[PDB]
Amino acid sequence: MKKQKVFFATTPIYYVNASPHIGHVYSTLIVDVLGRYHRVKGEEVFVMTGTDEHGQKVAEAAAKQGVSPMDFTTSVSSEFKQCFQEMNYDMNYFIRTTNPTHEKLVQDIWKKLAAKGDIYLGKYEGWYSVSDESFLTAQNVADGVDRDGKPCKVSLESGHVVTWVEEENYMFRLSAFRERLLKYFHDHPNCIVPEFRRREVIKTVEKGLFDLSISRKRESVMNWSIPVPGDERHCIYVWLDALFNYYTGALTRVATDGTETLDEDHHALNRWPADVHVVGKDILKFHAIYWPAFLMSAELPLPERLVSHGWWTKDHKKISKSNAFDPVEKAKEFGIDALKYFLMRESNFQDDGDYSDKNMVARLNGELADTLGNLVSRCVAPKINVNGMWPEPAEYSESDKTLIASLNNLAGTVDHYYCLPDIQHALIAIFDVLRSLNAYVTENAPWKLVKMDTARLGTVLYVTMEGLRICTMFLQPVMPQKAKEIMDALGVPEAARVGMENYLFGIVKPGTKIAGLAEGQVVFQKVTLP
Numbered sequence: 001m002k003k004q005k006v007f008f009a010t011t012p013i014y015y016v017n018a019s020p021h022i023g024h025v026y027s028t029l030i031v032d033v034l035g036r037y038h039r040v041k042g043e044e045v046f047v048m049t050g051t052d053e054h055g056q057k058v059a060e061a062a063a064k065q066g067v068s069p070m071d072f073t074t075s076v077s078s079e080f081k082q083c084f085q086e087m088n089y090d091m092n093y094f095i096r097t098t099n100p101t102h103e104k105l106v107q108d109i110w111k112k113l114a115a116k117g118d119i120y121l122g123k124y125e126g127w128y129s130v131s132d133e134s135f136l137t138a139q140n141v142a143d144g145v146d147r148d149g150k151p152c153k154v155s156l157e158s159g160h161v162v163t164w165v166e167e168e169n170y171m172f173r174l175s176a177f178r179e180r181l182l183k184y185f186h187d188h189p190n191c192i193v194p195e196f197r198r199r200e201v202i203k204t205v206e207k208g209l210f211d212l213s214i215s216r217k218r219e220s221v222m223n224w225s226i227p228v229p230g231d232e233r234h235c236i237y238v239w240l241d242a243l244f245n246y247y248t249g250a251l252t253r254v255a256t257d258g259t260e261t262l263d264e265d266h267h268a269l270n271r272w273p274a275d276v277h278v279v280g281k282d283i284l285k286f287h288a289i290y291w292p293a294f295l296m297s298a299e300l301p302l303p304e305r306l307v308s309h310g311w312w313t314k315d316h317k318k319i320s321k322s323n324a325f326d327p328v329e330k331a332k333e334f335g336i337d338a339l340k341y342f343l344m345r346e347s348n349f350q351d352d353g354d355y356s357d358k359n360m361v362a363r364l365n366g367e368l369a370d371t372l373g374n375l376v377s378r379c380v381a382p383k384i385n386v387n388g389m390w391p392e393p394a395e396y397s398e399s400d401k402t403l404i405a406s407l408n409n410l411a412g413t414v415d416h417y418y419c420l421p422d423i424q425h426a427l428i429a430i431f432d433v434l435r436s437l438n439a440y441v442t443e444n445a446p447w448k449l450v451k452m453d454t455a456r457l458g459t460v461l462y463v464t465m466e467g468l469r470i471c472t473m474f475l476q477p478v479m480p481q482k483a484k485e486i487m488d489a490l491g492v493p494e495a496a497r498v499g500m501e502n503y504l505f506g507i508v509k510p511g512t513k514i515a516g517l518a519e520g521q522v523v524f525q526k527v528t529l530p
């Protein structure tokens with residue numbers, strides 16, 4: 001009576017100094033796809049996102065607009081929740097670091113790290129940037145000019161003003177975890193993807209680590225941060241607070257009235273540790289080195305997999321309102337599912353993808369309409385499927401059996417890619433089979449069979465429709481509205497859409513009614529390039 005661990009995947013929790021943009025939408029889509037695939041696989045799933053709400057920069061922003069920090073972060077937090085509703089994401093849980101359960105948990109974790117002997121009182125001497133919430137070395141700082149045009153120092157990474165600090169702070173003995181980290185990496189060859197970002201991280205740890213500041217003075221962050229337990233002069237640094245959101249989520253019990261309590265430990269909810277943490281390549285180091293070290297100190301199971309991804313450009317340039325890239329607009333223009341497909345198909349996680357209307361139309365026209373939408377039309381066409389039902393197959397030929405084999409072989413390939421995870425190659429493998437299905441319909445010419453060989457027609461349509469069901473089931477994670485549109489048109493019963501029992505050829509009963517497409521209804525239609 002042992003249960004499988006719940007599938008648990010996370011987005012980063014996002015800063016609330018800006019409205020949701022393409023970066024947050026891409027990270028959340030990746031996680032939404034993984035979650036949806038593991039529900040299609042019939043597993044228990046818990047995927048989470050949320051907002052990173054503490055620190056000086058938020059306090060100064062809430063002052064500027066004369067509302068309380070809590071009021072400012074509630075409002076920006078609500079914009080993230082609204083964006084993720086508009087994008088048709090299925091997040092199980094949306095965390096805020098202002099949540100009392102989270103703020104208590106970070107203090108409990110602080111006490112665990114201290115009780116282990118991993119915290120000491122030291123002193124930072126060097127540069128800090130409120131706007132980056134980051135400590136900087138001398139080689140990452142340069143001359144610039146402040147709001148008043150006075151010569152000053154600036155971040156080479158962000159352009160922001162660099163306040164110099166000579167200040168006591170609590171510290172974490174990261175230097176002590178070098179060997180424990182190298183052995184985690186060595187015993188877990190897939191703990192980081194892509195595999196090369198893993199080699200680069202191993203080398204960073206081999207060069208040795210410095211100890212981390214994990215506090216700032218309460219005055220610095222205007223009391224908008226979690227107090228250090230037992231030393232109210234200091235507040236817990238925003239990154240330590242933020243990283244432990246994933247653990248808070250793993251412990252979070254949500255009653256049917258929406259009230260949230262934390263379990264005492266992770267075992268009963270059976271989510272921890274994460275199957276996948278999804279992050280932008282800029283926060284990879286924090287999740288690959290610092291985060292496991294904190295978890296080692298806290299004696300918690302370590303993450304299974306860290307997945308990093310790139311940043312989108314627009315029109316080979318570099319996104320700037322002055323091109324702009326509003327994914328909510330591009331979804332109104334082309335269709336939400338066509339945009340989700342493009343973002344998951346066009347680039348791998350190693351690369352910085354480039355959006356252009358030209359490449360968007362090439363994939364919508366050439367793959368979604370030409371391959372998938374046209375195959376659906378062919379299967380539910382009244383002139384081809386006269387009875388509007390799944391026919392009885394007759395004897396399969398060698399040709400028929402070659403295709404059935406590729407249908408049975410598809411789940412292994414697609415499951416392997418979704419679990420890697422490599423969503424781009426899952427999609428390529430599904431579309432290889434959708435292209436095969438169109439060639440198979442063409443080769444068999446049902447337009448002839450319908451007035452010549454009813455029995456052979458029954459075979460060709462049964463195989464094609466089963467093929468289409470299998471491919472569509474594996475597209476539900478990426479294009480959930482269009483996938484449902486296809487399953488409804490085909491008359492695939494609800495129970496046949498999800499679960500590993502549906503991963504093989506020959507599920508749907510001959511005599512099942514197809515619903516078809518209504519008169520003006522095309523699943524994907526080619527468009528012009530403007």
Ligand SMILES: COC(=O)CNc1nc(Nc2ccc(F)c(F)c2)nc2c1cnn2C
Nearest residue numbers: 124133134135211212213214239240286290
């Ligand atoms: C944001 O990252 C940085 O600023 C990197 N460099 C540094 N980070 C930190 N602490 C830190 C960073 C990330 C965390 F997840 C966290 F819990 C703590 N202390 C630093 C430097 C450089 N000297 N000292 C003393």
Ligand code: MET
Nearest residue numbers: 012013014015052242243
């Ligand atoms: C625990 S993930 C924190 C991520 C951070 N808010 C960022 O956007 O870079």
